[PDB]
Amino acid sequence: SVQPNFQQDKFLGRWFSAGLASNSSWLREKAAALSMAKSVVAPATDGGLNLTSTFLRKNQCETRTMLLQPAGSLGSYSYRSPHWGSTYSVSVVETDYDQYALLYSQGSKGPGEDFRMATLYSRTQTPRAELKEKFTAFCKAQGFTEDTIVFLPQTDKCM
């Protein structure tokens, strides 16, 4: 399930990781104990995307980069994780490009095959009420119970 007629160039740039829902209790715990700064979506070679996440961990600014390769329909990507020895599909399910994107990720190969995550990307660091509701409803249609949805703490300290 992808955004119809997905335009990758319009998806680029600065986003904020504003909420998530996952079936990993470990991941929800870690994320909520962090403060999120901007994410940057940039082009990689062969039509890929470089996703760079910045966050505050013990008042230290840190960054992680993920290489996403196009895979399947326009708007869908695959991510090979060295650390988890697994591959994950990541799809932009719904975006208006200018305000929000709803992402859905799940394992496709390896031990992480069962992993599932919904992500709210927002162009603003604090998403409006209606955007928060849109994300919660999306999480529920993806089969996440309400207590597995987390709106992530944000910081302006790594900008």
UniProtKB/Swiss-Prot annotation:
Its EC number is 5.3.99.2. Glycans are attached at residues 1, 23, 50. It catalyses: prostaglandin H2 = prostaglandin D2. Abundant in the brain and CNS, where it is expressed in tissues of the blood-brain barrier and secreted into the cerebro-spinal fluid. Abundantly expressed in the heart. In the male reproductive system, it is expressed in the testis, epididymis and prostate, and is secreted into the seminal fluid. Expressed in the eye and secreted into the aqueous humor. Lower levels detected in various tissue fluids such as serum, normal urine, ascitic fluid and tear fluid. Also found in a number of other organs including ovary, fimbriae of the fallopian tubes, kidney, leukocytes. Its main location: endoplasmic reticulum. Keywords: Cytoplasm, Disulfide bond, Endoplasmic reticulum, Fatty acid biosynthesis, Fatty acid metabolism, Glycoprotein, Golgi apparatus, Isomerase, Lipid biosynthesis, Lipid metabolism, Mast cell degranulation, Membrane, Nucleus, Prostaglandin biosynthesis, Prostaglandin metabolism, Secreted, Signal, Transport. One of its GO terms (molecular function) is fatty acid binding. It is found in: Rough endoplasmic reticulum; Nucleus membrane; Golgi apparatus; Cytoplasm, Perinuclear region. Disulfide bonds join 61-158. Changing residue 103 to A: Reduces enzyme activity almost ten-fold. The active site is at 37 (nucleophile). It is an enzyme of class 5 (isomerase). Induction: By IL1B/interleukin-1 beta and thyroid hormone. Probably induced by dexamethasone, dihydrotestosterone (DHT), progesterone, retinoic acid and retinal. Repressed by the Notch-Hes signaling pathway. N- and O-glycosylated. Both N-glycosylation recognition sites are almost quantitatively occupied by N-glycans of the biantennary complex type, with a considerable proportion of structures bearing a bisecting GlcNAc. N-glycan at Asn-50: dHex1Hex5HexNAc4. Agalacto structure as well as sialylated and nonsialylated oligosaccharides bearing alpha2-3- and/or alpha2-6-linked NeuNAc are present. GO terms for cellular component: endoplasmic reticulum membrane; extracellular exosome; extracellular region; extracellular space; Golgi apparatus; nuclear membrane; perinuclear region of cytoplasm; rough endoplasmic reticulum. It comes from the Eukaryota. One of its GO terms (biological process) is negative regulation of male germ cell proliferation. Catalyzes the conversion of PGH2 to PGD2, a prostaglandin involved in smooth muscle contraction/relaxation and a potent inhibitor of platelet aggregation. Involved in a variety of CNS functions, such as sedation, NREM sleep and PGE2-induced allodynia, and may have an anti-apoptotic role in oligodendrocytes. Binds small non-substrate lipophilic molecules, including biliverdin, bilirubin, retinal, retinoic acid and thyroid hormone, and may act as a scavenger for harmful hydrophobic molecules and as a secretory retinoid and thyroid hormone transporter. Forms a beta-barrel structure that accommodates hydrophobic ligands in its interior. It has been proposed that the urinary and serum levels may provide a sensitive indicator of renal damage in diabetes mellitus and hypertension. Elevated levels in the coronary circulation may also be associated with angina. Changes in charge and molecular weight microheterogeneity, due to modification of the N-linked oligosaccharides, may be associated with neurodegenerative disease and multiple sclerosis. Detected in meningioma but not in other brain tumors and may be considered a specific cell marker for meningioma. Expression levels in amniotic fluid are altered in abnormal pregnancies. Belongs to the calycin superfamily. Lipocalin family. Monomer. This is Prostaglandin-H2 D-isomerase. The chain holds residues 29 to 187 of 190 of the full protein.
